[PDB]
Symmetry: D2
Subunit: 242 residues, 4 copies
């Protein structure tokens, strides 16, 4: 029972679902935010009855500010924000439309901005020695064919992590980033080249599990990581050189 | 006389002006693109009479495609694109409006996208073993207080460099990035803390010169750098650890 | 009943690692170089701790100890290569002897310990852990530390090479790089205030137990998909 | 009349650096270790070239040579620390002697040459250049190269430390890290096709002259604001 409040965007499926389950297990009050799938959210809240869930498009800043203000009033503060929501719109760069660029930009970048602005304003005004953990990707670090738009936003996320870490370090807020490689989710379940990935590209020869990303995020949110800030930790079975 | 064609966006002032002058000296036909200052462009073209100049907002994809198609018809191809145009809209993150985010995103990211898409389509279709050089910033690499939006776009630029390098490597197109630290321009001429920067933060104890960035960009565009691709080279007097 | 070996495990960061792994249920063996009194005082606090005086740059004495440890406990699950020395000074005033002394411990000590332990981990099919301690000095360079920063960059490189070489065996190999940590290695500094005020965004030195917490995480089964990485714990001081 | 010293300057990448700096108007001194025939054949091609046989791990012989060079030409403007060896093999089969041999040349050779040259550059107020050759093996790790990758990571770290230490003197110190370059060091590989097909996006090895072009740029007055950096020339093979 940590007596702490955490927001996990994209917190009902995939990596976000595992992060939610891990912080819940550690005794956080968790608020999980999602975009469309009411069924997954309700099913997750039936499994974890103390969880709050909200359908909220994080690219809509006015709805984000309203939701963060609501959460702040019910639980007296915000101790941890995990910016995990994200989308992909793959395609070769020469066939990738403006719309695929702006859709991914508006969620992976502007959604992190909306949540982080609203939450950090509260942490600063109340002098909460809080935590922000962003989820990026090896794609943003090393590049990935067919992912110019995704990789761009994930590189932006790492840079925002470092800038904000410097801006809020004097307020005792740490701001870090976690960059997974290939994780067994649905975002990677439609791949057919999984065997070539494991056999040739990943030294540990397997995909990561959602729970393994959650364990790292939970370490960074805990009081055992207060001297770590501005860092990008890569969880990828050894796949890339950071 | 290189008998090559180069486009330099933001090519009439500051770093872009120096890049223009250096490629012109090396015998490129240079097309310099700018945003508003007709006087600077005309004055630069009076100094370099073989230079082409165009007032073109690179965030406007239809005007970009029209201009790139024009340049392609007049000079039979494009050998080198330098994506140098960029803006800053500084402010502390908690007071930085959506508009400051989207203005910087639309030029530093979407402007690079529009130019690179139009130019790379031509290089691929004609099998030109061409060059793209993007201009980023130490701000994107290490973060900078008051520059969440700028730093985000400059990190995105580095990630796009790596993705596109991988996508076009088989076509013999190299795609690299140059990240200056503090360069003596007008973008840094309004600073009052310049002495503290030089005395304490920069080991070489001076700002860089525009021509020094241009010399690096010109090396990367030359035939002496065809085995370098996907890299980010930092020119900063030693200021940061990459 | 997992077995951990912590070199330099009786003072400073190593002591805190020993204490943390002890608290987490490991059988811990702490190796030290010369200070018998500190070692015995720690064994007083932690009665189940084994302590051995061993110069890790002596390959034969290292092999003897690792083989004895392995015979006694039936395996080795975790090696923390923490022992390290500094011999600082301007490059132009830094003798060959200051280079070789720091190389022989910070590089060859890691090599000797890791050769002995990994051979056993691989022979016994142990999905073990090696965690090496480097430094931000090796990542970003540091005036007056050409020799120290050389070996700490070497340690990071060795971590990455060994992670690739032993991945198929399920042995992860990671590195922790601290910034300024409050220990004896840093008690003599005169510029502590200026480092805190100007160089460290969090405006304080780290504590040894904060390094131990990160080491303990990497050693646990909650970190099995992290390998070959160097994680910096430095209050924001450097860009990795 | 600038003076450049290129260690290992008679074969492979070093030969191409010697040739490039010669073409650029330097007085070049090429240092080599044992192959007199190759050295004389290069001096035949480049009549103004000085060549010396010198084991750079011997500090006294290095000091003798640098002091002679300096007396003859009145200064030293550029040192390229290019000499290097590999003694590859699995970590568990890599003797102490393979570690020390590679350390003594790849680390201590750089140290001995750089101590001698930087002392003179600083004494004479020369705004000189040191360029060190590392490797992607040191950046990202490489199976079978624990010792080589150790020293190449050390070289990168030393570059950064020396860049900070000598910046106030106007001496820039940079590192070039090649990927796979067509030389004798790589002629014996059997997996060349698979490396080209799968690991190198540009699908070819680099040429020695492409490394020399980058070295020559860093040595020129067009690179005076670049210091402490490691520039990778590798066809896209790794992420830095
Ligand atoms: N999976 C992998 O292999 C890798 C993942 N990552 C990162 O991991 C994170 C999570 O990935 P993963 O678990 O696979 O993703 P999933 O696609 O499985 O889940 C995405 C979640 O984001 C929510 N979401 C999407 N758009 C919005 C929006 N506009 N506003 C609010 N919520 C939104 C979804 O809501 P809903 O359920 O209603 O649709 C869902 O809960 C991402 O940020 C991704 O970039 C990074 C590298 C690799
Ligand atoms: N200067 C420095 O210290 C640093 C610079 N950089 C990078 O260097 C690059 C150049 O910097 P610097 O020379 O100082 O910049 P300047 O502000 O001096 O020049 C910017 C140029 O960009 C053009 N431009 C701006 N917006 C657009 C647009 N929408 N479409 C087309 N052209 C446009 C301007 O046109 P016009 O002249 O008509 O206004 C001008 O020519 C930037 O990308 C910047 O991020 C990176 C790190 C530090
Ligand atoms: N403290 C800091 O700020 C930073 C530390 N580090 C790294 O952290 C590690 C620990 O540093 P710190 O705790 O400050 O060091 P201390 O000097 O406080 O402790 C060093 C320990 O290493 C042991 N040791 C030294 N040489 C040998 C040897 N040849 N064989 C066996 N044991 C040996 C010592 O034995 P004995 O007790 O008998 O002397 C002692 O237990 C080092 O690797 C260091 O480089 C990295 C960055 C910053
Ligand atoms: N080739 C590649 O693919 C890569 C190379 N590198 C680096 O590039 C550099 C050159 O490599 P490469 O050209 O392939 O090497 P070569 O083996 O082809 O050439 C080595 C040169 O170093 C000289 N040398 C060796 N030991 C000594 C010594 N103790 N004292 C003086 N000179 C010595 C040799 O002298 P002699 O001629 O008498 O034998 C020779 O001139 C090295 O630092 C290497 O690590 C890095 C990454 C990849």
């Amino acid at each position: 029972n940590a007596m702490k409040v955490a927001i996990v965007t994209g917190g009902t499926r995939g990596i976000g679902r595992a992060i939610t389950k891990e912080l819940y297990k550690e005794g956080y009050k968790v608020i999980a935010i999602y975009n469309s799938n009411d069924a997954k959210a309700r099913a997750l809240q039936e499994e974890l009855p103390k969880l709050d869930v909200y359908k909220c498009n994080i690219s809509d800043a006015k709805a984000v500010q309203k939701l963060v203000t609501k959460i702040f009033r019910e639980y007296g503060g915000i101790d941890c924000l995990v910016n995990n929501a994200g989308i992909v719109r793959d395609g070769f760069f020469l066939m990738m439309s403006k719309e695929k660029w702006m859709d991914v930009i508006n969620i992976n970048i502007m959604g992190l901005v909306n949540m982080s602005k609203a939450v950090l304003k509260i942490m600063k005004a109340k002098r909460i020695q809080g935590k922000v953990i962003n989820i990026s990707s090896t794609s943003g670090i090393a590049g990935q064919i067919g992912q110019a738009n995704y990789s761009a936003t994930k590189g932006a996320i790492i840079s925002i992590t470092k800038t904000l870490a410097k801006e809020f370090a004097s307020d005792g807020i740490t701001i870090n980033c976690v960059s997974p490689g290939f994780i067994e989710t649905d975002m990677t379940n439609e791949l057919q080249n999984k065997e070539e990935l494991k056999e040739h590209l990943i030294p540990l020869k397997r995909f990561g599990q959602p729970e393994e990303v959650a364990w790292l995020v939970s370490f960074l949110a805990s009081e055992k990581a207060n001297y770590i800030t501005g860092k990008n930790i890569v969880i990828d079975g050894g796949m890339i050189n950071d």
